[PDB]
């Protein structure tokens, strides 16, 4: 295979280790000196060319921004089949963070502050992914990881689209995303825009401050596109700051051209949190 932005890393070079998630794996990464290196592996009937595969992972391996993860290079294993490798993330999702910090063995008590500061770390990654013309097409708490120092990246990009490029080879995945995170006019075709990741980032929000919480209590996957034809939305997350529901309630305005950018968005979260003591 033709690797011309040289993003491929010797498949000798890589030993797999225990399994994370489902899939990802931990593994272990020998550097150009004897040192190893700990690593995250991702995994993921009609298939396009490997080298567009290949040229999508080059790009984002030079995505450079706090709060977005940086791609290592893809490693080829045998029909070829290729693994992302990314830097290892020992905190792990910020979706099953929250629901542990409501343990008394798990993170302390999230304070407020931190829980909007997580939200300034997701628009600020999302902010740049928008600038570069990137759909993420799956953001939610679950696809943000915590690094070491407690800050969020935005990451799981295996489905996004860059606006305009092909995308025939991601359809049948497109079509079975959790239905609770999809923006109300993307629901009917499965057609995404920048505004869908916005309604997408308010759902987000929404997790964080409820700590973790299935979206929509009460409202089942079928029935989730009628609830929001009816106008209903995600309620009030107890102790959430009015100001801070508002942010939120604005991602998810019908007409997708009425909701705010992620700049705007970002900056409005900023002054939220300098504005607490
Ligand atoms: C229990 N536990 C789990 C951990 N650590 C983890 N768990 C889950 C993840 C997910 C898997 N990640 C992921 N981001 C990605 C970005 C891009 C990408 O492909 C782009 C190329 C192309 C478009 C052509 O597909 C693939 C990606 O996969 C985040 N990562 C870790 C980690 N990094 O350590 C600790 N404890
Ligand atoms: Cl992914
Ligand atoms: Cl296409
Ligand atoms: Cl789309
Ligand atoms: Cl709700």
New binding site residues.
């Given amino acids: 295979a033709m690797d011309p932005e040289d993003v491929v890393i010797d498949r000798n070079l890589l030993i797999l280790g225990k399994i ?2 489902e899939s ?1 794996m931990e593994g272990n990464l020998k550097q150009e000196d004897g040192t190893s290196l700990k690593v ?1 592996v ?1 995994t ?1 009937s009609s298939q396009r060319e490997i080298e567009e ?2 040229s ?2 080059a790009c ?1 391996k030079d995505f450079s921004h706090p709060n977005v ?1 940086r ?1 290592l290079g ?1 490693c080829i294993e045998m029909i070829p089949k ?1 693994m ?1 490798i ?8 910020l979706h ?1 963070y929250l629901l542990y910090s409501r343990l008394e063995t798990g993170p302390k008590h999230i304070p407020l502050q931190t829980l909007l500061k997580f939200m300034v770390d997701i628009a600020l990654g999302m902010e740049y992914l928008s600038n570069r013309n990137f759909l993420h097409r799956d953001l939610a708490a679950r ?1 943000c ?1 915590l690094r070491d120092d407690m800050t969020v990246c935005v ?4 489905l ?1 689209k860059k606006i305009y490029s092909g995308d025939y080879y991601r359809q049948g995945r497109i079509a079975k995303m959790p239905v609770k995170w999809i923006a109300i006019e993307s629901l009917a075709d499965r057609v995404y825009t920048s505004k869908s990741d916005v309604w997408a980032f308010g759902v987000t929000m929404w997790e964080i401050a409820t700590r973790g919480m299935t979206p929509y209590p009460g409202v089942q996957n079928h029935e989730m596109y009628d609830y929001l034809l009816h106008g209903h939305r995600l309620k009030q997350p107890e102790d959430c700051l009015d100001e801070l529901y508002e942010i939120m309630y604005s991602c998810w305005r019908t007409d997708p051209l009425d909701r705010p950018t992620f700049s705007v968005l970002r900056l409005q979260l900023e002054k939220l949190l300098e504005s607490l003591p």
């Fill in positions: 994370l998630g990802v995250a991702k993921m595969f290949l999508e992972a984002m993860i791609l893809v290729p992302v990314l830097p290892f993330m020992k905190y792990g999702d099953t696809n990881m990451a799981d990009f295996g996004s």
